[PDB]
Amino acid sequence: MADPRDKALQDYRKKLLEHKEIDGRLKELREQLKELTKQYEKSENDLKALQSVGQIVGEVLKQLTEEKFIVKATNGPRYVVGCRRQLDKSKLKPGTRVALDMTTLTIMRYLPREVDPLVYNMSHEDPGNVSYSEIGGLSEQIRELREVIELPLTNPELFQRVGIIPPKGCLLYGPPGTGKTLLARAVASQLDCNFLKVVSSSIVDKYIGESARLIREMFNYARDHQPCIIFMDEIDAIGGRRFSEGTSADREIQRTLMELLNQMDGFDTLHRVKMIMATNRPDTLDPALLRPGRLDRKIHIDLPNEQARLDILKIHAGPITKHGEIDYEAIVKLSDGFNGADLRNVCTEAGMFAIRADHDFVVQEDFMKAVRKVADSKKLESKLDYKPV
Amino acid sequence: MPELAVQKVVVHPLVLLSVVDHFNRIGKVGNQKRVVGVLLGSWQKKVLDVSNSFAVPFDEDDKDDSVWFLDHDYLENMYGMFKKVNARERIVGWYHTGPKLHKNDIAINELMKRYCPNSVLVIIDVKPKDLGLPTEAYISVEEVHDDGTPTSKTFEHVTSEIGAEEAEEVGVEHLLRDIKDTTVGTLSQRIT
Amino acid sequence: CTKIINADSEDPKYIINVKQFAKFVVDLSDQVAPTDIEEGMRVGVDRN
Amino acid sequence: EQDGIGEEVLKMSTEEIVQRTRLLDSEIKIMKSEVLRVTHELQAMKDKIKENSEKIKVNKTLPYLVSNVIELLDVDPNDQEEDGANIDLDSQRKGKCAVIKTSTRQTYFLPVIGLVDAEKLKPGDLVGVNKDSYLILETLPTEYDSRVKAMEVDERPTEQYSDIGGLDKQIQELVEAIVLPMNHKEKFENLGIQPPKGVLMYGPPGTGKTLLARACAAQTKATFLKLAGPQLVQMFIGDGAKLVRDAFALAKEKAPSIIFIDELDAIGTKRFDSEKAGDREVQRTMLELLNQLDGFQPNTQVKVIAATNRVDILDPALLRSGRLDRK
Amino acid sequence: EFILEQMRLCLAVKDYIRTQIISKKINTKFFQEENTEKLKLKYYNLMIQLDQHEGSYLSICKHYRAIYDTPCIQAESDKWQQALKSVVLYVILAPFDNEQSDLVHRISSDKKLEEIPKYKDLLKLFTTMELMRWSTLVEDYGVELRKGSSETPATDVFSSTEEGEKRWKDLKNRVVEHNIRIMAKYYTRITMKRMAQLLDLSVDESEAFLSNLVVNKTIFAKVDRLAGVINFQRPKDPNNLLNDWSQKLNSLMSLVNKTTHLIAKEEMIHNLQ
Amino acid sequence: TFLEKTREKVKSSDEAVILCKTAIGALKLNIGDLQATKETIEDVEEMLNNLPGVTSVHSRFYDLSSKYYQTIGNHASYYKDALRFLGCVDIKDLPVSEQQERAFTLGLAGLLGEGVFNFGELLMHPVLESLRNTDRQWLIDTLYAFNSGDVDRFQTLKSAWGQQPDLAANEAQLLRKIQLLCLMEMTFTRPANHRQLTFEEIAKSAKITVNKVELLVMKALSVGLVRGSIDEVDKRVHMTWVQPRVLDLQQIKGMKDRLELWCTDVKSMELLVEHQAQDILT
């Protein structure tokens, strides 16, 4: 190369390089061999999966002693099973899922408590939230709710000093569109914990008393994973009355209703799980359910007031791109007739008019159009969710 | 290589019977020339279940204990077949047919360790040793003694017991033409 | 045959409803036409 | 490699390097013999594997049951919690395992395939499982019934907008409202608005309320779900309600998409209080619908067309915005 | 800041109790942080005086120790000598029971503790079970504990401060009761008289220590005023002797059968030799 | 620097890698880099240990670690490390001189300790035993006295001790320690039939007052040489248990005697057990 000695070295080097090419051949064959071992372990473990069946899952009905456990198997017939000694009997105790064998009928192992796929859909959902207030200035009523639900659950210590009986639950009623469901999201927004937003139009089942038992499984789940606030949605059919001189649906609503009563207070008291119920029509529910002393606050949410309408526009105005206007405020205040859901819709529907014209901007003319349109549509269907005023 | 996956060694009645039966089959050797064979059994467990054994033709001389024959080729080929039988059957270690261990056994152990992932040398005896265990299990250990001995490779004992499997246990009763005055279930048995 | 779903990896997949009311996915007939297995069509499938 | 460095000069003589070259000639030939050995070792390992493969092959093919994933346990490939005794480890020990709740209405805790592990399958999948001994061979897409098939995307024909003359203004509102936020979601965001949660078309029968929507949607090319309100109601109690929830979920995956709902007195009954009727089941399908429109995002992407020829049985919430933005 | 201000003004008038409860309600986490560090120092320094007067021993150990850990005190050589030794002194002062024994382990673990030879030696008697004399302990106590420290030229607040003397007296009761604890478990029976020779304190003083000890329930004793005997761990039932007798025989059988397995290997010979 | 340089490649398989590592440890120790010596000593110690083939190499390395402990002057730590050398000992490939210095220092070192006892082990190895000098003749007789567990033999030797001042400073500690050992030694050796000891025996032997022995006996139990209870009013310390001890001269003899008593009883007893209960005996 750069030394006359490096030139001599270079002729020798070729032979060292040659020796590596012969090793290369050997090396290819090893390369496949390194992969072949990973696949070996995988397949050997796979044979053990193939001879092994999909063993019966069960639950412990009653543990009499270590050697005799009664199980409710998922195939149907309840069995007497044994246990292996490589397990602690404390884990396996009743109300807990356990694995069962199918080769021998013995409890294989401990499985943690389990929840249905239905409960997963309900646990996932929450977003679309608002920061704190449904509507600003009304904020005092909102705080009261917060005071009821959040605090005792997180920290009981404050309630202990005072010596008082803690606040329990909230029942929400108000007109359709006011923002009852949004409040449910709102409390969730700030806190950021485990949530079960439980739709009650999927707890229901064709069999009777399976739906009641189900709701109960969700309450248990919320306790394990505290903090939790359970938002009950659409209880105009999971809460009702006795009924039952008709369909198979009618026996079913009364049963599901029984569960909501116990949880509110009838042997189980709200401290470990807290519930806010958002209801369309409060006269659907039970005369028992309403009764105060298993509910603390019964909050009535009011529709927008004159000054209350302005602040909501102010939050909407940030998302929307306009020419550099802020015109919405004055026009809404003189007019009348909005509920919370309609106010966000004047801003959404002005945005639609702009898009037809082609603008990324919303003009003062668009907004005007929306106010007339929304009022017009109310007139056709003034058949809103009946509450006497 | 690891000798790890053992804290206990249980051995089936099958293991013993296979060695006496196999002696006739091979050559009618009869412990004239000691035999070493593969010890087969389970893995992925702390406890070692020796399910099975097969003989390998190994003759060790009685002129000399440093010379032996051990048929290597049989081991690789028998390997693929074990999976046809069950996928819990793999080579755990080796067996010595006794009457006793040797120093020579360390050398026999190094060859067998390449195949196994948990090699152990378990002496299953062709003669039953007393009314006690006819098996003793040992594992190769590097240790010093304060006797003024530097590093040795020797055999230190690990606890041996006799176990059984559900299929096998039933089969044993049927085969048996003894009734058992040594059952040890009750007062009558207990006094004996 | 209840429904036609393709994620084919052998021969065309169909989900059938057995009369023990377990759903099973089966595949294109052993020799008969794919044009004879349709949605809302009856099919004979092996018991074993 | 080692040579052709300046360090080599210092360390060694020239004579050492030439002598090393002479040794190399013999060394390469030996390495060539070694080629034959390596190939030989590779085949022996493979043979064990080949034995194993025969077993995997049959299970993978037919028959296979259809099931859902309840939960994920996992316990690694035959490591477990050391539950292995002197009872079999091919009939007790499981590999990396998944808990599944099957469609029969049983549960099985099962050993999944060692090659493609249990960790990969998450809760919510619709999977095949082996009938004999349970293993999850592979995954199957969303598969259920013939009612569910219609809901899955495949365009619905054009009946043309040039079948109705006049009422021009109304046509412009439908094409803007439904078709544009679906493709052009970027623009709805750019302006600053959420894409609708739907449009309600109301009026007297025969005007062409349905006529325009179906016609325009094919022409533009769209991802078309065919949902019918009376279909969603069923004779089993609140099973019907679950279907709505699932049907919308189907739209959310596919997103953005337009769900055409033909008619809305069967998931738009007016009633929130009733007794002694088939209206009890009908009310629940309607209530689940209200919830699906409410905000949880990817469900502002997906659009909704609902139609009525009446107003004297329309559900006020669904008419009200924030369920269906446009009227 | 709030607790800091309030604690100082109430300290001047002398009202320890009202602030002291409040300080615990505020979570312990807040004080530890670097941002708060400057306040933390001030806050604790006040608090340690406050709790001292109250006589809450357990609380001083914690407070001084929180101080010890904080980054500036650890980093600088001087600062930790006073803070950690203060914990070491409060830990001996704390009620003689299980809490005391648990705290002595914690301090002794500290690497910083171990480098001082004096204090290392001092812990080593408490840590042992070998019988440790009051006479020896006292000369060792003179140099180390009374001034606070002896490995830096500073006074640590423990003894020779206005509250400090108050605590020192108790220190005598703690050490003697500890000497008794270690001793009590080994000796089933001792005469009152012999115990005095062992403690290097009179029979009357030992009697009073045991009265306090039995109440804490560190070890049960029966003590007589007759002077006959002090009995530790004896019920005076034949039941004890019957169960004890059985246990020794039960282990023994097990031993013989295991030993012979290894023996079998030795026995073979001409392969070892 | 040079030692490290040589460590490169290998012909086939030759053990040469480790030798260079041990040699760098030896070099470190002389120079005065103690810390460095230590880290390399830890690495080699594993590599050597694994093979059965290393006799000699492992032993020089072990001597090297004992040298580091000795330089500090902390005797307790020194004695322990030295023990690993005593097990590994061999005279071959180990210089006569390094061994000689180490053995004399060690002999002194164990005695100085507060709670280390392996005197029986020392008798067993020729490295300390065969090694003899003027000073060494008395020092081995003191180790022997210790091994048997006799307070009185040990203490009579006291005049000789003074030749070493080390022994003279902690003479007090040394006499108490023999006695502490005696509790363990006497109970395992002389009584098969009993296991209790009086205080008075210790007292005369030690020629130490009665008041002290009760206190010494308490320390004995705390170390764990003996476990049991002490009953003051009966003037006995009863041993439930005796600590295992490394092979001693007195010991081996007692074990044989007790095994003989045991064989004989088991044969007599076997006849009684068999003789009665005839109808169940089959």
Curated annotation (Swiss-Prot), chain C:
Superkingdom of the source species: Eukaryota
Residues with N6-acetyllysine modification: K19
Record's comment on post-translational modification: Monoubiquitinated by RNF181. Phosphorylated. Dephosphorylated by UBLCP1 which impairs PSMC2 ATPase activity and disrupts 26S proteasome assembly.
Residues passing through the membrane, by range: none
Subcellular location: Cytoplasm
Family per similarity comment: Belongs to the AAA ATPase family.
Its job: Component of the 26S proteasome, a multiprotein complex involved in the ATP-dependent degradation of ubiquitinated proteins. This complex plays a key role in the maintenance of protein homeostasis by removing misfolded or damaged proteins, which could impair cellular functions, and by removing proteins whose functions are no longer required. Therefore, the proteasome participates in numerous cellular processes, including cell cycle progression, apoptosis, or DNA damage repair.
Complexes and interactors: Component of the 19S proteasome regulatory particle complex. The 26S proteasome consists of a 20S core particle (CP) and two 19S regulatory subunits (RP). The regulatory particle is made of a lid composed of 9 subunits, a base containing 6 ATPases including PSMC2 and few additional components. Interacts with NDC80 and SQSTM1. Interacts with PAAF1. Interacts with TRIM5.
Record's protein name: 26S proteasome regulatory subunit 7
UniProt organism field: Rattus norvegicus
Curated annotation (Swiss-Prot), chain F:
Ranges for domain PCI: 77-244
Entry annotated with the keyword Glycoprotein: no
Family indicated by similarity: Belongs to the proteasome subunit S11 family.
Keyword entries, A-Z: Acetylation, Proteasome
Presence of the UniProt keyword DNA repair in the record: no
Job of this protein: Component of the 26S proteasome, a multiprotein complex involved in the ATP-dependent degradation of ubiquitinated proteins. This complex plays a key role in the maintenance of protein homeostasis by removing misfolded or damaged proteins, which could impair cellular functions, and by removing proteins whose functions are no longer required. Therefore, the proteasome participates in numerous cellular processes, including cell cycle progression, apoptosis, or DNA damage repair.
Record text on subunit structure and interactions: Component of the 19S proteasome regulatory particle complex. The 26S proteasome consists of a 20S core particle (CP) and two 19S regulatory subunits (RP). The regulatory particle is made of a lid composed of 9 subunits including PSMD13, a base containing 6 ATPases and few additional components.
Annotated protein name in UniProt: 26S proteasome non-ATPase regulatory subunit 13
Example of a GO MF term: structural molecule activity
GO biological process, one term: meiosis I
Organism: Rattus norvegicus (Rat)
Residue list for modification N6-acetyllysine: K204
Any GO CC annotation of this UniProt entry: proteasome complex
